[PDB]
């Protein structure tokens, strides 16, 4: 989700 | 193991002694004899292992097992 | 009670056949007929 996604713009 | 070799016991009974007339299923009786002989071997060798408290059967326990059971299994 | 009579008739089916088909087996040479030996067991 946009939470699982928002955890991969924190990295990227 | 769940087997009993028909061919091997007959070949042994013919190789060792050339003059017999072992019956149709007499070799099956020979297999039963060896099965029970090796039963006695396994159990009295377990006793031999507990005699020296060895957790693995070794040569020095089997040689002591032989002179008891093999002599006992003689007819 | 209906299950009682149904199971009872199933028993008299199985045992009637235990009398009939066991004459296909049938006793032969006291021994004790396999019907009687079985039922004693």
């Amino acid at each position: 989700g946009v939470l699982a996604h928002l955890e991969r713009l924190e990295t990227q | 193991k769940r087997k009993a070799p028909r061919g091997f016991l007959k070949r042994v009974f013919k190789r060792k002694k050339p003059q017999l007339r072992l019956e149709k299923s007499g070799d099956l009786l020979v297999h039963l004899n060896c099965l029970l002989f090796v039963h006695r071997l396994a159990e009295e060798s377990r006793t031999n292992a507990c005699a020296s408290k060895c957790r693995v059967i070794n040569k020095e326990h089997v040689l002591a097992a032989a002179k008891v059971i093999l002599k006992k299994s003689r007819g | 009670k209906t299950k009682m009579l149904n199971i009872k008739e199933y028993k008299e089916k199985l045992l009637s056949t235990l009398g009939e088909f066991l004459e296909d087996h049938f006793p032969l040479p006291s021994s004790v007929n396999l019907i009687t030996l079985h039922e004693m067991l």
Binding site: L3, L6, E10 | K1, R2 | -
Partner: protein, 517 residues
Amino acid sequence: EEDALQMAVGYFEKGPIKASQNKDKTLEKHLKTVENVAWKNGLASEEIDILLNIALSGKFGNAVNTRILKCMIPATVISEDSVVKAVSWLCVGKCSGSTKVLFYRWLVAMFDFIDRKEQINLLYGFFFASLQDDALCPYVCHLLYLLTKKENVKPFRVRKLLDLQAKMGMQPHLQALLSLYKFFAPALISVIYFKNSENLWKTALLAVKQRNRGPSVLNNSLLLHYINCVRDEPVLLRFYYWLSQTLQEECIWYKVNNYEHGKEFTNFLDTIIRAECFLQEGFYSCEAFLYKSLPLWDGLCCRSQFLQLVSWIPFSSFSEVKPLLFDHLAQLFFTSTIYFKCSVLQSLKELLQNWLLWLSMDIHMKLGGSMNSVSKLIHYVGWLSTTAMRLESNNTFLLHFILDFYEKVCDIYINYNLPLVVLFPPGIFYSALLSLDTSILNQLCFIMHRYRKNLTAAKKNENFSSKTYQEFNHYLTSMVGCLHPSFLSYAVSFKWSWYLDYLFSQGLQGLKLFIRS
């Protein structure tokens, strides 16, 4: 001609092979070329498996040469199994043990094609008593592993299997059968797996597949519907205690790995999250774990999972849940980056829906003090989302998610039948009004248009009126006079109605819904 050819083979059996004028392997080999096309009709398979295997010619090569390919074209029928159980009679003829091995391999390989498997299951003991002989045990074990039902697990069979295990070896086939008997009534306990050997037959059996083609409860979706429907006491407590002790032990598991244990816990919290999205009420261990593990929580440790758990939190009071949880979803909200900030007003966005659903049917199943809870949640987010607007210097990304929250605050009356029209706090309203992009400007415009619609709907059915209408007319006169920087970007990229059309046409749909209103 095969029916004629097989009755000729039976004649080849009523007489000797020597007395025959022609070879059997010639005519049976014509039948074998037929088997390479189509081996045995249900009646043909029946009869040729019956007479060729009971006592007659049926050479342990010839009966096997057929038995390798004596399976069925449509399906195997009961009468096939019937008197081949009288080949399992296993007597003066017996179809001696090698052909018995191929026969039980036949049944194992084609157990899938019988019209009435219950009939053979009703024949369970006839094959179970065939387990005692050594040569068929590796195959009869497979067959009964395929035939076993609860009615066939009588304790005497359990003791017979134990006697077989004690007398014979620990053979994995007996272990597989024991696994089934433990899966049924546990009169025995034990702790390979349908690895078949019919793969050689599965050349023909894969042709048969092609021939048929041509000619404690979370990981159970089918059972999750039960717990979805029972709000019962000893099951929501049998399940609460498992979730609390799985989210504690396996979260203490973080304190020893935190890297490799951080992938099963994530994938288990994903199953919890999915189970709650389906079952639709927050598990009472999901909040109870959250209050326990929110203060200790960091920003990014299972953020995607923790901030979806917050969504499913049994509406409490927003006076007993605020200090316990929301005082920590502000303790980390105001100290973490935008990428955690947007993950909370999204988390609380979904929390708002998951509270408003459970309030809609609270109208359906027959308020005021429940009203004050969602209103205060939205204001506290509206307090959260004016100071998060200040931390990040009016970052458009964060305010986009803020409006995404408020995209679900405009439509409270229309959507959830709840009279809770809560307007913008101005620290967001004008901060997006005088923002610098339109994908946030048209967003605000959509929200306020749905606000106009919802307030008009609330005026029909009926404090909101006085101060809420005053604030919305404030947000109107100030903005409708203001309806500009991102619009200026469009105008630079660009007769007032034509400007409109250039707008409107280019995706400005919230502006469309306002301007039409």
